[PDB]
Write a protein that binds this ligand. Sequence first.
Ligand code: HEM
Ligand SMILES: [O-]
Length: 154
Amino acid sequence: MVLSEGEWQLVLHVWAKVEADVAGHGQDIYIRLFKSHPETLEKFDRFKHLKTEAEMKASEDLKKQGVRVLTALGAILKKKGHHEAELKPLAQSHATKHKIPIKYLEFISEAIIHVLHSRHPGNFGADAQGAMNKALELFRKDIAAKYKELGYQG
Ligand code: HEM
Ligand SMILES: [O-]
């Protein structure tokens, strides 16, 4: 599975807009994920008690977590497929420490696409969304292969 350079440029052009305010984007993505698929919130021991969107928005720890996730994902995207080193620690923690199935990675990918589609119509038209979907599918395909190497079904 391989993206073209043009596809990577569409991914990186919208990611540059995320980077104007990574914290705010992270909050929107987590709120979308937890509202759409409430079961995913149960995996977060520090945040599973949050009851409403207002509580999620006011959580400084959730905001910091969103920054960590999007910055890690941004570093992966900037490797344009050459992300073996970045995926090692992430696959190990998500398979063995956090126990995050591939289906939940699909759910957060959907939340990312939903938020970019809402916030960034200037850089998230159909071709750009297609490229981002391809990049996230590549990420999940490579994470799933590493999960299997690590002993986790996913
Ligand atoms: C785009 C996909 C994702 C990325 C890039 C990502 C990235 C990260 C990073 C960088 C950390 C901190 C270091 C670590 O423990 O590895 C983290 C922690 C964590 N991740 Fe993810 N993650 C992703 C998806 C998910 C999903 C979908 C879930 C659950 C449904 C999840 C559950 C967790 C939990 C529970 C923690 C620990 C949080 C805490 O310290 O309170 N991750 N993630
Ligand atoms: O995460």
